[PDB]
Design a protein around this ligand. Structure first.
Ligand code: NA
Length: 129
């Protein structure tokens, strides 16, 4: 499922992300946009360490979900990575909160790259969130 911009903002808001641990909806939106283009079916294989990024937030197999093929990996969100590839993003959202639980949304390099210290307001404008 490829989410439309405002549809995703409302979906994220309903799932409890607006201001979650200080992170505004605009920031989460900036992350999902650059990570997957609002695409829940997105996957990215990292040949270097044999891990894979899954779903709309492109959560990595080495630490957060289990795919059975990443060497010495863990499963902090306690879910099959398959769960992060569905149309309903509730699981991805609960796992995204865990990723940021330790120390912020800066967990994703892409967010620091194209979201941190940028004008992100555009991502929620007119969405009624
Ligand atoms: Na894993």
């Amino acid at each position: 499922k490829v989410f439309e911009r405002c549809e995703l903002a409302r979906t994220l808001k309903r799932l409890g992300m607006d201001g979650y641990r200080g992170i505004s909806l605009a920031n989460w939106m900036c992350l999902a946009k650059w990570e997957s283009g609002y695409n829940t079916r997105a996957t990215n294989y990292n040949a270097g360490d044999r891990s894979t990024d899954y779903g709309i937030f492109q959560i990595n197999s080495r630490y957060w979900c289990n795919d059975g093929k990443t060497p010495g990996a863990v499963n902090a969100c306690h879910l099959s990575c398959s769960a992060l590839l569905q149309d309903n993003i509730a699981d991805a959202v609960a796992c995204a909160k865990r990723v940021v639980d330790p120390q912020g949304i800066r967990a994703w390099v892409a967010w620091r790259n194209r979201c941190q210290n940028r004008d992100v307001r555009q991502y929620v404008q007119g969405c009624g969130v």
